[PDB]
Amino acid sequence: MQRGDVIAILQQALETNSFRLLFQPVISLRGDSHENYEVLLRLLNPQGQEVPPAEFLHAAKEAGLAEKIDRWVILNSIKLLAEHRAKGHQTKLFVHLSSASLQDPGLLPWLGVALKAARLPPESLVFQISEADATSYLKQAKQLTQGLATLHCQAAISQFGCSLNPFNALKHLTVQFIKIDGSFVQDLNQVENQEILKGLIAELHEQQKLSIVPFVESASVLATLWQAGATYIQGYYLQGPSQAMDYDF
Amino acid sequence: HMQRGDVIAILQQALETNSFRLLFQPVISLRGDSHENYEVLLRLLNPQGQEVPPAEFLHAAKEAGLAEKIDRWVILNSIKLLAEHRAKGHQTKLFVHLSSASLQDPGLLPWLGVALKAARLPPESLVFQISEADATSYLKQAKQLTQGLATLHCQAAISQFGCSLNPFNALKHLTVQFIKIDGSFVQDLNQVENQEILKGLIAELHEQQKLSIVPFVESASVLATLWQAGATYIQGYYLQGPSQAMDYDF
Ligand SMILES: [Mg+2]
Ligand SMILES: [Mg+2]
Ligand SMILES: [Mg+2]
Ligand code: NA
Ligand code: NA
Numbered sequence: 001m002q003r004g005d006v007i008a009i010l011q012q013a014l015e016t017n018s019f020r021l022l023f024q025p026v027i028s029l030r031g032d033s034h035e036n037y038e039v040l041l042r043l044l045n046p047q048g049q050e051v052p053p054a055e056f057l058h059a060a061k062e063a064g065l066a067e068k069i070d071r072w073v074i075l076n077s078i079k080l081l082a083e084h085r086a087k088g089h090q091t092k093l094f095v096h097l098s099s100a101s102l103q104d105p106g107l108l109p110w111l112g113v114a115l116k117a118a119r120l121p122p123e124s125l126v127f128q129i130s131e132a133d134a135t136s137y138l139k140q141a142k143q144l145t146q147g148l149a150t151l152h153c154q155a156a157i158s159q160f161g162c163s164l165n166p167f168n169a170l171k172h173l174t175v176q177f178i179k180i181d182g183s184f185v186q187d188l189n190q191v192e193n194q195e196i197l198k199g200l201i202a203e204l205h206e207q208q209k210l211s212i213v214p215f216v217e218s219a220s221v222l223a224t225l226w227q228a229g230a231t232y233i234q235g236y237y238l239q240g241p242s243q244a245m246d247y248d249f
Numbered sequence: 250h251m252q253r254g255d256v257i258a259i260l261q262q263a264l265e266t267n268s269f270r271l272l273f274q275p276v277i278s279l280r281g282d283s284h285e286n287y288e289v290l291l292r293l294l295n296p297q298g299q300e301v302p303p304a305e306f307l308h309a310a311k312e313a314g315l316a317e318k319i320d321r322w323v324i325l326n327s328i329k330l331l332a333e334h335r336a337k338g339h340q341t342k343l344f345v346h347l348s349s350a351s352l353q354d355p356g357l358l359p360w361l362g363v364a365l366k367a368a369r370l371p372p373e374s375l376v377f378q379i380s381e382a383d384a385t386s387y388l389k390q391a392k393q394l395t396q397g398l399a400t401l402h403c404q405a406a407i408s409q410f411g412c413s414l415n416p417f418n419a420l421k422h423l424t425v426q427f428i429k430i431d432g433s434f435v436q437d438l439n440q441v442e443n444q445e446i447l448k449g450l451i452a453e454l455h456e457q458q459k460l461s462i463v464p465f466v467e468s469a470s471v472l473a474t475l476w477q478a479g480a481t482y483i484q485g486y487y488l489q490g491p492s493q494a495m496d497y498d499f
Contacts (some may be wrong), residue, residue, distance in 0.1 A: 001489040007468040054432075055486040059467035061436045182304075186311035217256040217309035236305040239253040 003048040006059035009045055014065075014072060019043055021076060025247035026094065026212060027238050030231050035249050038094040038128075038234065039077055040241050041069070066098035067107075074111070077125065078118045085121055091245065094126045094156060094177075099133045102140050108147040115151055122152030128178060131159045134171045143197065145174040156212070161200055170207065177232075178204050179212040188224050201229045250272060254295050256309035261393070263488060264318055269293055272491035273304060276344060276462055276484050279476065285499050288344040288378075288484065289327050290389050290491050291319065316350035321360070328368045328374065334495055335371075344376045344406060344427075349383040352390050358397040365401055372402035376427060381409045385419050395424040406462070420457065427482075429462040438474045448478040455479065 019041055026036035042081050043051045060066050070215050077093050084091040101107055115125075127148060134141040134157055145155045160166060161184060170178075184197050197213075203245035204211045216222045216235030225233055263269050269291055284481040293301045310316045311472060321332050334341050365375075383393040384404050384407050395405045406427035410416055411434055420428075434450060437443045447463075454461040466472050466485030475483055489497050 002492045003486055003488065004490075005468045006486050007470070032377075049490075050485060052490055055465060055467060055490065058432055058435065058465040059486075062438060062465070062467055064437070064439060115458050182308055185308060188312065189314070214440045215305065215308040215312070216340065217305060217312055218258065219255065221257075221312055236253060236301060239250075240302055240305060240330050 001045070001049055004045045004051070006043075006051055006056050007063040007065075009043065009051065010056060010059055010063060010065055010069070012185065013043055014068065017072070017076075019069075019072065019076075020243065021073070021080075022241035022243055023093075023245045023247075024234060024241045024249065025239050026227055026232050026234050027216075027249070029226055029230055032232070033249075034090045034092045035245070036092045036094065036232070037247070039073060039096070041073055041096075061098075061100075064100075065103055066100040070096070070101045071110070077112060078114055078120065081120050081124050082118045082244075085124070087192065090121075092124055094128050097127050097129050097132075097144075099136065102129055102133055102137050102144060105143075107125065108144065108151075111148075111153075112151055113226070115153075123154055124152075126154040126156050128156040128158050128177075131157055131161070131163060131169065131181070134173065135163055138169060138172065141169075142172045149174050152236070158212075166201065170209075176210055177212055178209045180204075181212060182215050184214060185215045185221070185225075188219055188221070194224070194228065197225075198228045205229060205231075251293075251297050251299055256293075256301055256306050257313040257315075259293065259295055259301065260306060260309055260315050260319070263293060264315070264322055264332070267322075267326075269319075269322060269326075270493065271323065271330070272493055273495050274491045275489045275497040275499070276482050277488050277497075278482055279479075282482070284340050284342045285495065285497070286342045286344065286482065287495055287497075289323060289346070290442050291323055291346075292297065302476050311350075312347075314350075316348035317335075317354055317357070320346070320348050320351045320396075321364075324361070324375075325364060328370065329365060330495075331370055331374055332368055339495070340371075342374060342376060344378050347377050347379050347383075347394075349387065351382075352379055352383050352387050352394060353401050355390075355393075358401075359404060361398075361403075362401055365403075373404055376404040376406050378406040378427075378429065381407050381411070381413055381416065381419070384423065385413050388419060388422060391419075392422045392424075395449060399424050417453070417457065420459070426460055427462055428459040429464060430454075431464050435463060435465045435471070435475075438471055442477070447474075451478045451480055455481075 022040040023037040043056045155175045158179035159181045160178045210231040212232040213230040214234045216233045216237045272290040273287040293306045405425045408429035409431040410428045411431045451461045460481040462482040463480040464484045
């Protein structure tokens with residue numbers, strides 16, 4: 001019961017609408033009152049056991065289902081936002097887009113329709129694409145990001161800073177948030193890493209981006225990142241992924 | 250609380266109370282190999298019994314200078330489990346991850362010899378798995394570590410292989426028997442092009458005398474493609490996901 005054909009389990013989670021959505025809050029250090037949450041996707045097998053994320057994420061690609069799962073995630077997110085601005089909550093969701101989605105001319109038209117249906121507050125959704133993907137497909141990244149702006153969505157680049165000249169890719173994109181890569185967060189006891197981190201963050205602030213620094217695993221890491229100038233932070237010390245959007249912002 | 254905490258503090262205490270959990274994911278032979286082979290994976294529960302996401306505690310470890318201590322905990326507990334799983338007809342081999350902090354520590358190798366001296370394991374019971382990026386950043390220490398492992402009758406693997414500028418260059422200077430191909434090569438295998446690249450890569454690994462391991466077998470169609478390509482070993486949830494027990498039927 002810790003095995004299965006993940007490609008078939010995915011084909012059917014889709015058909016029973018049975019993925020599980022999790023939410024990991026993004027914490028504002030500089031006065032953002034939104035309830036920002038990153039959306040994460042989980043999958044259970046028929047026997048109710050969780051399939052390792054790396055495995056079903058790789059399955060989804062092996063099956064050519066990435067884009068179709070993105071649409072399920074987007075529609076269910078749109079749903080939840082509609083149901084959450086129901087109360088006072090200023091919820092904002094960070095939703096991942098696969099490379100397959102990025103390369104797809106059809107995403108934008110499709111999205112415009114769904115958003116119209118839902119009638120959500122503007123700037124309710126942020127689409128997050130990896131640095132590697134934006135860099136592979138700069139032209140499509142450029143097209144997609146301008147498009148989102150017309151729809152009153154925002155964009156984020158994640159795993160930022162690992163490429164040789166990472167700020168170049170940002171030249172023609174419309175992106176408000178930049179989530180720095182996890183590697184920058186390691187061993188900040190070494191003054192040199194504090195400086196690398198600090199200059200990355202300052203360079204981002206200089207290009208007028210909002211920095212998001214992940215993997216805050218204790219209060220000292222949090223304090224260090226606050227001093228370094230981080231706009232937002234995320235990590236288990238604040239809250240790990242949860243099935244509910246119940247974080248006290 | 251239920252789903253938050255200071256993971257650095259949790260790690261420091263987990264180390265002291267031995268309350269990490271080891272899981273095992275079978276590495277499965279297509280070329281007969283006698284062994285039960287398992288990859289060792291580390292899990293962590295918070296004090297309230299809820300699982301801390303591995304990426305979060307692996308980062309916490311690096312943030313607190315605890316990576317090598319965690320590796321040593323895993324090694325000792327892996328040695329322990331092997332000696333016990335020997336209590337049966339199980340010719341088990343374990344793949345154990347080494348962090349870049351361990352790879353860099355010249356203290357590692359003599360410490361390893363003491364750990365092994367005490368446990369009386371069959372030779373070639375442990376394979377130490379280093380990522381390509383780590384091996385490539387620290388090639389001198391990887392050369393030294395891997396020659397040393399052979400002296401200790403251990404083996405070595407490079408994982409996420411095939412992503413660096415010239416992947417086969419690093420291999421010239423290391424003592425490594427297993428090569429675990431990066432998952433990037435296992436995508437879109439639907440496409441004949443990607444099948445041929447993978448097939449070629451595996452063939453080249455064979456030429457260079459390495460045993461290839463291909464991860465992310467997520468269905469029969471993927472297994473089917475990999476079979477054809479002559480992979481020495483495979484791994485994935487379609488065969489068996491990580492489990493708390495070494496009870497796969499090889
Ligand atoms: Mg299938
Ligand atoms: Mg996250
Ligand atoms: Mg594994
Ligand atoms: Na945008
Ligand atoms: Na700082």
